[PDB]
Amino acid sequence: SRRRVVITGMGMLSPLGLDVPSSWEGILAGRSGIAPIEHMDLSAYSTRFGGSVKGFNVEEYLSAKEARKLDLFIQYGLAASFQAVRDSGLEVTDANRERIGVSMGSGIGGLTNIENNCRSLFEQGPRRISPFFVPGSIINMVSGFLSIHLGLQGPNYALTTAQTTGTHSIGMAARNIAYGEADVMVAGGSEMAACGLGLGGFGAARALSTRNDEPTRASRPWDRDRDGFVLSDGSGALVLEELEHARARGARIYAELVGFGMSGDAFHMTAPPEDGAGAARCMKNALRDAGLDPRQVDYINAHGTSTPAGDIAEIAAVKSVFGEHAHALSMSSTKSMTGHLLGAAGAVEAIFSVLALRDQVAPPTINLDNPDEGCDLDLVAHEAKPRKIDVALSNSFGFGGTNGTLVFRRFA
Amino acid sequence: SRRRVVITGMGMLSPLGLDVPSSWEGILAGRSGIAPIEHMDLSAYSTRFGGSVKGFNVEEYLSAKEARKLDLFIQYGLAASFQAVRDSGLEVTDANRERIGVSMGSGIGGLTNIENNCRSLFEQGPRRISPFFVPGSIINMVSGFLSIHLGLQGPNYALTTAQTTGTHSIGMAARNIAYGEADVMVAGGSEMAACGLGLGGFGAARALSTRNDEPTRASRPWDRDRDGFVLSDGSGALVLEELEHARARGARIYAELVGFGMSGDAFHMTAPPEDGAGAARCMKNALRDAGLDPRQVDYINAHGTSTPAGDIAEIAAVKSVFGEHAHALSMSSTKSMTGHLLGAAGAVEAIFSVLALRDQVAPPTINLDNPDEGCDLDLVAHEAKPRKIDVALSNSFGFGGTNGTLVFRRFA
Numbered sequence: 001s002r003r004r005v006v007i008t009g010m011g012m013l014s015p016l017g018l019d020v021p022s023s024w025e026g027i028l029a030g031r032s033g034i035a036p037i038e039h040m041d042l043s044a045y046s047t048r049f050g051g052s053v054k055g056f057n058v059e060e061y062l063s064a065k066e067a068r069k070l071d072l073f074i075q076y077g078l079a080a081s082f083q084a085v086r087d088s089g090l091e092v093t094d095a096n097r098e099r100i101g102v103s104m105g106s107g108i109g110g111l112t113n114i115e116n117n118c119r120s121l122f123e124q125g126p127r128r129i130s131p132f133f134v135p136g137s138i139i140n141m142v143s144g145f146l147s148i149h150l151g152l153q154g155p156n157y158a159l160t161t162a163q164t165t166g167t168h169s170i171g172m173a174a175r176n177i178a179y180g181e182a183d184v185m186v187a188g189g190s191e192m193a194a195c196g197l198g199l200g201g202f203g204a205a206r207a208l209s210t211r212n213d214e215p216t217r218a219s220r221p222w223d224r225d226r227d228g229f230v231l232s233d234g235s236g237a238l239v240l241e242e243l244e245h246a247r248a249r250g251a252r253i254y255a256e257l258v259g260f261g262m263s264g265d266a267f268h269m270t271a272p273p274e275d276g277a278g279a280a281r282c283m284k285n286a287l288r289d290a291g292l293d294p295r296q297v298d299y300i301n302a303h304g305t306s307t308p309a310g311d312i313a314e315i316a317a318v319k320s321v322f323g324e325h326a327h328a329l330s331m332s333s334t335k336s337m338t339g340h341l342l343g344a345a346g347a348v349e350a351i352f353s354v355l356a357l358r359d360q361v362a363p364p365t366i367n368l369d370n371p372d373e374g375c376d377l378d379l380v381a382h383e384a385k386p387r388k389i390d391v392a393l394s395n396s397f398g399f400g401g402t403n404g405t406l407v408f409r410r411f412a
Numbered sequence: 413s414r415r416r417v418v419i420t421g422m423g424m425l426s427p428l429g430l431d432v433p434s435s436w437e438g439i440l441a442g443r444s445g446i447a448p449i450e451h452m453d454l455s456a457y458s459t460r461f462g463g464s465v466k467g468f469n470v471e472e473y474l475s476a477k478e479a480r481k482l483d484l485f486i487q488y489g490l491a492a493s494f495q496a497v498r499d500s501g502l503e504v505t506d507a508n509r510e511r512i513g514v515s516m517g518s519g520i521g522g523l524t525n526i527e528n529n530c531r532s533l534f535e536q537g538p539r540r541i542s543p544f545f546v547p548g549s550i551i552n553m554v555s556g557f558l559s560i561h562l563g564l565q566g567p568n569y570a571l572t573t574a575q576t577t578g579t580h581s582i583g584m585a586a587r588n589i590a591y592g593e594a595d596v597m598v599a600g601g602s603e604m605a606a607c608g609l610g611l612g613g614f615g616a617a618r619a620l621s622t623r624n625d626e627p628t629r630a631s632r633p634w635d636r637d638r639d640g641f642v643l644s645d646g647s648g649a650l651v652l653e654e655l656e657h658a659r660a661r662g663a664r665i666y667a668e669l670v671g672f673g674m675s676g677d678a679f680h681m682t683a684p685p686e687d688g689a690g691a692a693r694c695m696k697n698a699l700r701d702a703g704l705d706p707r708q709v710d711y712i713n714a715h716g717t718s719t720p721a722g723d724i725a726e727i728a729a730v731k732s733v734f735g736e737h738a739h740a741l742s743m744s745s746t747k748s749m750t751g752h753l754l755g756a757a758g759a760v761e762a763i764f765s766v767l768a769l770r771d772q773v774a775p776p777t778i779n780l781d782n783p784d785e786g787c788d789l790d791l792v793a794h795e796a797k798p799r800k801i802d803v804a805l806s807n808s809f810g811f812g813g814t815n816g817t818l819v820f821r822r823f824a
């Protein structure tokens with residue numbers, strides 16, 4: 001029968017820091033992690049900035065000879081995963097290794113590596129493709145390499161649900177534990193899509209902000225002057241653990257994962273419906289799953305991408321689900337500061353939602369200078385808001401009409 | 413307690429055929445789908461052959477306009493999915509659409525689109541990248557497009573576990589139904605990694621057969637002269653359905669899905685442990701999940717990739733799990749005929765496992781001319797074997813050490 005699931009460990013690389021505390025300090029201070037991209041020449045591109053991980057040292061985690069064969073999305077995913085496992089205090093033994101698994105996802109995975117090998121193929125030939133091309137690039141290898149390094153023999157898989165990946169990964173991992181398929185899961189996501197194909201591809205779709213001359217002000221969810229999302233890199237990982245398992249070993253419990261919702265829009269390959277009907281169905285599924293009155297919700301970490309259609313669909317969904325309570329909860333987009341980490345967005349934002357619960361503070365939506373028509377909720381404009389938070393919701397929506405909602409609450 | 417899950421619809425593209433019954437006729441006749449790859453200059457490549465889909469007509473499924481937006485692997489995934497839904501007879505309505513979901517996956521995703529867009533980027537610059545590059549290449553777009561086309565509002569997601577993708581997709585969709593998150597799921601996988609990048613990337617690892625002179629004899633699981641796997645393209649999809657839901661509408665039931673197991677080797681990035689310890693744990697987990705004793709298994713559809721280490725690990729795992737029953741079951745690799753469809757392997761092989769139950773026949777392992785040291789099981793060498801089959805397993809053992817096993821049983 002269905003078991004309870006708590007969060008005992010968290011790990012992060014973000015545009016705001018190389019761990020969780022440094023990232024959360026930036027969040028509460030309203031700091032932007034967005035800047036012109038330094039790692040490649042983008043003069044031919046319509047967008048030349050994003051949220052890079054700054055000063056990442058993979059040799060804090062892995063030998064250079066290994067790191068050299070792994071795409072950055074794997075390196076980031078492993079770094080966050082190692083942080084989360086160390087943060088949990090869990091010791092992997094012969095007695096528990098079959099009961100610990102991993103579900104770390106990505107939207108696009110090792111596009112940098114694939115692009116670089118495609119260049120070798122076209123300019124030189126197939127004789128110059130890296131022997132590590134497949135295991136160093138494909139999405140399931142965060143889960144794979146983490147299991148090899150820590151000895152995890154439980155369920156080993158990866159989700160790829162575009163911008164919903166991190167949320168689905170955590171929710172599905174929580175169901176594994178709930179249903180008895182595992183006692184512990186490391187779950188979240190990682191992304192590094194800032195290569196020519198990624199920036200060029202999102203650029204060709206005209207999905208990105210082109211605020212090149214003022215990158216820190218580009219991501220402005222629900223602001224009338226928003227012009228699309230800001231591409232960002234990094235990783236979030238959480239250690240999810242069955243409650244009695246956590247209690248038995250005296251684990252520090254950050255919060256309880258009480259609800260998970262999924263739904264499909266069945267509307268459009270890339271556009272969200274204006275009424276946010278799929279997002280509403282998803283949140284209602286999650287609140288029913290959590291056994292909650294919707295009035296219990298204190299804080300929503302929105303998807304809040306800074307796209308024209310996405311931001312207004314989320315206001316419409318929150319008003320539909322919460323009615324008059326929509327005006328009492330606080331909702332913010334931390335993508336205002338981090339930008340959009342794509343398949344990692346739901347992972348870092350689950351962590352921010354747990355820290356909102358730990359610290360009793362709603363992170364700000366920076367850059368919300370002029371809220372757009374209908375954007376008249378408490379969106380925590382500009383400055384962090386200390387407040388009572390017993391229940392926090394994290395929402396994600398993605399290409400394919402794919403929706404995910406996580407519901408966290410304080411654990412006594 | 414848990415609901416029962418049956419198979420009510422199947423769909424396929426393979427190197428043997430453009431649907432299930434054509435592919436299966438090929439399988440029982442011992443026909444190879446392997447041939448030199450056409451319309452590519454593979455001069456510089458060490459492998460020039462594979463399993464292509466022959467004569468695929470996407471306009472049976474999609475408008476020319478929607479087809480131009482989607483990678484081949486997505487086209488193949490949608491063809492299998494549409495076939496499976498038609499085969500099921502299911503009518504989607506306002507009363508059930510929130511209870512019907514999709515989990516169609518891929519191991520490597522859109523390498524053909526990535527190649528073509530790299531060509532544009534490198535030749536002409538980023539402003540020639542296709543506007544539909546990202547949404548037309550990402551792995552969750554089979555689930556995405558299918559949900560939009562058929563109006564499916566249930567759980568919408570995509571797995572990517574390398575060569576285990578199709579097995580995991582089917583198993584996790586079965587869990588969704590068994591635990592009441594959906595009543596119907598479309599599940600499986602699709603792959604198109606011919607392309608220069610697949611043949612080049614697997615070739616760089618020296619993982620492929622290089623038997624260019626005799627492509628149909630290349631894939632020879634457990635044969636002492638095997639020299640690696642054969643890359644193949646296509647798709648498999650099943651309609652999974654809660655039993656009472658199937659009975660109420662008078663569905664034709666092919667078989668029951670009674671067990672699903674997962675494990676991680678936690679061993680190596682691409683090679684299994686010599687004794688297949690992880691594969692043994694996975695099969696034991698799947699049998700425990702079905703409440704079956706190993707003695708009850710009649711037929712195993714092996715992973716059987718034709719890699720020297722993989723094939724011998726499976727023999728050890730099966731001997732380990734089945735003890736004095738290990739010679740009584742029949743185990744065959746249909747990859748001997750189809751080659752290795754990577755993330756679609758487990759999807760087409762689940763279908764072959766269901767059809768073994770329907771038709772009471774073990775498909776052959778073709779090319780098994782000289783079984784290797786210790787390969788002394790009933791590997792159904794050369795010719796199909798009519799036999800009693802009540803319980804059929806399908807195994808996938810993929811990169812990152814990620815394992816899946818499905819257990820099917822006759823339904824009456």
Ligand SMILES: CC(=O)N1C[C@H](C)Oc2c(F)cccc21
Nearest residue numbers: 063065066067069145148149681
């Ligand atoms: C875990 C793994 O696969 N390792 C770790 C091992 C210590 O070294 C490596 C290497 F040199 C090159 C590539 C990978 C690895």
Ligand SMILES: CC(=O)N1C[C@H](C)Oc2c(F)cccc21
Nearest residue numbers: 018019060061082083084086087
């Ligand atoms: C030592 C080092 O730089 N770090 C930083 C990070 C906050 O935690 C770590 C970890 F959990 C596992 C391995 C390394 C590190």
